[PDB]
C-alpha cells in the first residue's frame, strides 16, 4: 500500500466521503469506533513513515491528513497520543499544498489539508490557516481565526495543558475557568 | 429616505464578516445593537416594509430581524420574537429573486431564518435553499432540521420558552 495508487488510500477517503461532515465536525462515539476499527494500522504505517509515498497523489494525501490529524482526534481521545503526530501531519499538508493538493480535491474537503496549520502552537502555522482558510470562508474562516486568537494570546493551547503536563499560568487559568 | 440605512447595515455586516458574524463578541454585540436598535424595532413595527423592494434592502431585513435578535438579545425570548416576521419577509425576498441577486458569501442570511423556524416544512425548505451552497452552511442546515425532525422544535429553547422537557428531549440534552 506504499504508492499513492493504493487501494487502502482510497478507502480512506471514501470512508470520510461517506460519513460526511455529520461526523466530520460532531462528536459520536460510535463514528470514532468505526473509523479506529477501520483505520488503526493504517495509521501507524503512515506515523511509522510507511506511506510517504501517497504524497504522490490529490486524495492519498487528503489520506495522510486524514490518518495523522484526524483519526488521533477521534480515535486517542483525553491523552498525550491526540497530538503525537501533528508535526508530521504540518510537515506533510506544507508538502500537498506545494504540490497544489489542496486545490485537486473538492472544496468540501479542502479544509482537511488546512486543519494541521490551525492545530499547531505556532503563530507561523496560525498565520498561514487563516490565509488558506480565507477562500474558504464563512466557518471556516471563523474556525480557523478563533484557533488564532488563542495561539496569538497564549502562544499555546491552555487545553491541552493537562495531558501535556504544562504549568497553567494564572491568565491561562482565568480563560480556562471563564469557558 | 431608509434606503441609506439599509445599505448601512449591509456595509457595518459586509465588512464585519465571517470573523464576527459567528463569534461571541460582546463589544460587537453592543456596537451592533447601539448603531442598530432603532431600525429593528423599526423594522417590527413594520415601518420598513418597503425595503423588500431591494435586494441590499432585503437583506438588511434579514439582519435586522434573524440576526440583531441573536447577537444583541442573547439568552432570553426576545431571540425569538421577530422570527415569524424574519421567514415571512425571507419567503417573499427569495419570490422576488432577492437572494440570487446576491453573491453566495452574504445570500445564506436569506435562508437561515427557515433554519430557525421551529416547524419541520421549514427546516425542509431551509436544506433545499443552502443545498448549492454545500460545505458547512448546508452542514448546519441539515443538523438544524435533524434535530426538529425528530421533535418537532429545539429542546436547547425549552428553558427559554418554559417548556417542560420530554424523556426523550431530556436525554437528547444530557448527550452532547
Ligand atoms: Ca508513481
Ligand atoms: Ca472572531
Ligand atoms: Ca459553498
Ligand atoms: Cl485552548
Ligand atoms: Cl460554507
Ligand atoms: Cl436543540
Redesign the interface.
Given at each position: 500500500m506504499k504508492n499513492d495508487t493504493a487501494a487502502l488510500a482510497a478507502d480512506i477517503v471514501d470512508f470520510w466521503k461517506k460519513a460526511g461532515?455529520?461526523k466530520w465536525?460532531?462528536?459520536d462515539a460510535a463514528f470514532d469506533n468505526h473509523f479506529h476499527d477501520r483505520f488503526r494500522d493504517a495509521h501507524f504505517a503512515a506515523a511509522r513513515r510507511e506511506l510517504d509515498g501517497w504524497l504522490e497523489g490529490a486524495e492519498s494525501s487528503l489520506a495522510l491528513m486524514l490518518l495523522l490529524d484526524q483519526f488521533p482526534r477521534n480515535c486517542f481521545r483525553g491523552t498525550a497520543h491526540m497530538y503525537a503526530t501533528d508535526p508530521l501531519a504540518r510537515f506533510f499538508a506544507d508538502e500537498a499544498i506545494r504540490r497544489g493538493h489542496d486545490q485537486a480535491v473538492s472544496?468540501?474537503l479542502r479544509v482537511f489539508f488546512y486543519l494541521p496549520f490551525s492545530h499547531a502552537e505556532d503563530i507561523a502555522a496560525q498565520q498561514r490557516a487563516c490565509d488558506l482558510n480565507q477562500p474558504?470562508?464563512?466557518?471556516?474562516?471563523?474556525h480557523a481565526?478563533?484557533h488564532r486568537d488563542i495561539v496569538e494570546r497564549f502562544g499555546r493551547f491552555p487545553h491541552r495543558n493537562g495531558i501535556l503536563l504544562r504549568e497553567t499560568t494564572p491568565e491561562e487559568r482565568q480563560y480556562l475557568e471563564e469557558g
Open positions: 461532515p455529520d465536525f460532531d462528536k472544496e468540501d474558504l470562508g464563512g466557518l471556516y474562516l471563523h481565526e478563533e
